[PDB]
Amino acid sequence: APLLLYANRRDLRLVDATNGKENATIVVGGLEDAAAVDFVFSHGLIYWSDVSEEAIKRTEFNKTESVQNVVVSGLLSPDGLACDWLGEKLYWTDSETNRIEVSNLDGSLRKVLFWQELDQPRAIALDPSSGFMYWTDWGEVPKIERAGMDGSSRFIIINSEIYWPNGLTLDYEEQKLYWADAKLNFIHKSNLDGTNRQAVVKGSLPHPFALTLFEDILYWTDWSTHSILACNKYTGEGLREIHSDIFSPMDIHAFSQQRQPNATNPCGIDNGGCSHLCLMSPVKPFYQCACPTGVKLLENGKTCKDGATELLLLARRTDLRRISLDTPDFTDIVLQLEDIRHAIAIDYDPVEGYIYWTDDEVRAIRRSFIDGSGSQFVVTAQIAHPDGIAVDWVARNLYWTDTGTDRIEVTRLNGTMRKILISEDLEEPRAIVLDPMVGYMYWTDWGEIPKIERAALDGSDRVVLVNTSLGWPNGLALDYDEGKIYWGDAKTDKIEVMNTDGTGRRVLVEDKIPHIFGFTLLGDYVYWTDWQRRSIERVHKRSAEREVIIDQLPDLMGLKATNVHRVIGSNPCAEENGGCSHLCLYRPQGLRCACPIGFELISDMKTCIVPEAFLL
Ligand SMILES: *[C@@H]1O[C@H](CO)[C@@H](O[C@@H]2O[C@H](CO)[C@@H](O)[C@H](O)[C@H]2NC(C)=O)[C@H](O)[C@H]1NC(C)=O
Ligand SMILES: *[C@@H]1O[C@H](CO)[C@@H](O[C@@H]2O[C@H](CO)[C@@H](O)[C@H](O)[C@H]2NC(C)=O)[C@H](O)[C@H]1NC(C)=O
Ligand SMILES: *[C@@H]1O[C@H](CO)[C@@H](O[C@@H]2O[C@H](CO)[C@@H](O)[C@H](O)[C@H]2NC(C)=O)[C@H](O)[C@H]1NC(C)=O
């Protein structure tokens, strides 16, 4: 007696028994807007997607409430879902992020398979027997596609006689795959190639939402009629509708251990396949090696590197995000954090892996471990508009500018030992970069006469690098072992370059530049945000040519491209803090020790104490 399992927006539901007594059972319930479901029968698992919650979840078939969030991020319209009961993976399409991804059956090791040339991928079917997954994307040009469940050999099989190509489901007995259509109202049938395209229920009668099958019988949903239907597997004949008065049936599968034929796993329980991901494959070994998103795989294969090497950190108004720079996929942003109101500037310290960022409604500076409970505060007092921040990764101090108080200030990374280095009456400091070797700190500031200044790392030797033809200078990156210094200006709308001493100057490209501007350099490439702050460009600094790695991401505020772990340069401050008891600030001549407000430097030129304290 084939049990049918189907989503229903408000709940998941199991029905049929032997098609009698109308025992539709509410498997899970109290959902909000469920679309897709699937199961791994052996383990008694039921998965679904929820379009209002943008999450994918799972439960235990037994009498239990047990529900676990499985994906809860990066999803917009997950409308297709397929479990791999063999290789033990989870696949799912997302019709709006136009991605196709995979994970372990617990949401972990989440790899994006495909992401290019996808228009509204929906229905999805796995063939773990072979290494083939099938899905349908439809849009300006609809099509059914095949590829390996490993990301290989993406083949377009059926690309004609289709419009809104509908549910996918395969006959393992016959090595044929069926598909429907939500517009042209047919059911068809082919070989697992694009081959032998036969009609099973041609003619405009079927208006199926989701197809399944079990022993010669095609079942499906017609949301319109609020019904479930069924007919011969071989012709349209037999077309009765199973008992069905059902409130918006969506996705549906035959809930039967026979619809998942088990077999030999291309990796054993041995190996566990690789180090992170063993995905099935048509390729000779019949399994393939994978790392999570943005993570590259060693030349040996089978072993994934540790995390990404470079990394592009985003600051939106109300979240932070990182895009990796190790892989082609890019547009895999991923985010984190709570209580972020209005983020402005961002920077990072590869040594301890803390992200630092400014928020100018909260008026505070904070740090985190990326996707880590890193989150502590750092500064919260006497702040206005922290429009720019710089980590000094050698002396282990944190610099930040302020627009409201027109100051530059330094603290140790933990926000201790605060000390005002620069405080100008007219001009007001905006964007800031550091050179802990060579001992310089450069910064743009706006004002009645907008200039670009520089100084030693303690504010001492103020030199005005740029003075003329600058309206509102914005971003300000630094090319180190090339001694150039890139910046932007919102008013004039052109990205210029320069010699480290303010001489090699020249427009690089023209550009319409936002007032709040993200702008950073790393490895021949420059990254900035567009005028509408919904997209990020990658530009060759040596070659001048542009490109857009990610759009449709509003409220972009500030960017930082950075190595993870990797660090470069040094100076004597790295030696037990220069010998200074509090603040050690490097200069071209040589480091100078400093003190928090109220303290006093003793003739050591190394030590601070609070005056009128002791008598010694
Ligand atoms: C479930 O599938 C697995 C994987 O094929 C079966 O486990 C073993 O599979 C090998 C592969 O041919 C057989 O040689 C063994 O005989 C299988 N185990 C044994 C000793 O039964 C497993 O049999 C399948 N479960 C069933 C019974 O349906
Ligand atoms: C961050 O704060 C910690 C304590 O919360 C500081 O740790 C030591 O603090 C004493 C007291 O001034 C200093 O004499 C030590 O030099 C500090 N240790 C180190 C590692 O230098 C610390 O100074 C602050 N930031 C650092 C440097 O970790
Ligand atoms: C920005 O303008 C100031 C003031 O005009 C420049 O400072 C001096 O400018 C006068 C001419 O107006 C020169 O004779 C001096 O040589 C300048 N100062 C010195 C001694 O360097 C300042 O140079 C301008 N900023 C820059 C460097 O572009």
Swiss-Prot record:
Region (Beta-propeller 1): 1-256
Cysteine disulfide partners in this protein: C267-C278, C274-C289, C291-C304, C573-C584, C580-C593, C595-C608
Annotated region (Beta-propeller 2), positions in chain: 309-570
UniProt PTM comment: Dual phosphorylation of cytoplasmic PPPSP motifs sequentially by GSK3 and CK1 is required for AXIN1-binding, and subsequent stabilization and activation of beta-catenin via preventing GSK3-mediated phosphorylation of beta-catenin. Phosphorylated, in vitro, by GRK5/6 within and outside the PPPSP motifs. Phosphorylation by GSK3B is induced by RPSO1 binding and inhibited by DKK1. Undergoes gamma-secretase-dependent regulated intramembrane proteolysis (RIP). The extracellular domain is first released by shedding, and then, through the action of gamma-secretase, the intracellular domain (ICD) is released into the cytoplasm where it is free to bind to GSK3B and to activate canonical Wnt signaling.
Annotated glycan sites: N23, N62, N262, N414, N467
Location(s) in or outside the cell: Cell membrane; Endoplasmic reticulum; Membrane raft
Induction pattern: Decreased levels on WNT3A stimulation.
Phenotype for R592C: In ADCAD2; impairs Wnt signaling in vitro
LDL-receptor class B repeats: 44-87, 88-130, 131-174, 175-217, 218-257, 353-395, 396-438, 439-482, 483-523, 524-565
Domain EGF-like: 263-305, 569-609
Subunit structure and binding partners: Homodimer; disulfide-linked. Forms phosphorylated oligomer aggregates on Wnt-signaling. Forms a WNT-signaling complex formed of a WNT protein, a FZD protein and LRP5 or LRP6. Interacts (via the extracellular domain) with WNT1; the interaction is enhanced by prior formation of the Wnt/Fzd complex. Interacts (via the beta-propeller regions 3 and 4) with WNT3A. Interacts (via the beta-propeller regions 1 and 2) with WNT9B. Interacts with FZD5; the interaction forms a coreceptor complex for Wnt signaling and is inhibited by DKK1 and DRAXIN.
Disease: Coronary artery disease, autosomal dominant, 2: A common heart disease characterized by reduced or absent blood flow in one or more of the arteries that encircle and supply the heart. Its most important complication is acute myocardial infarction.
Record-stated family: Belongs to the LDLR family.
Domain remark in the UniProt entry: The YWTD-EGF-like domains 1 and 2 are required for the interaction with Wnt-frizzled complex. The YWTD-EGF-like domains 3 and 4 are required for the interaction with DKK1. The PPPSP motifs play a central role in signal transduction by being phosphorylated, leading to activate the Wnt signaling pathway.
Name of the protein this chain belongs to: Low-density lipoprotein receptor-related protein 6
Portion of the full-length sequence here: 20 to 635 of 1613
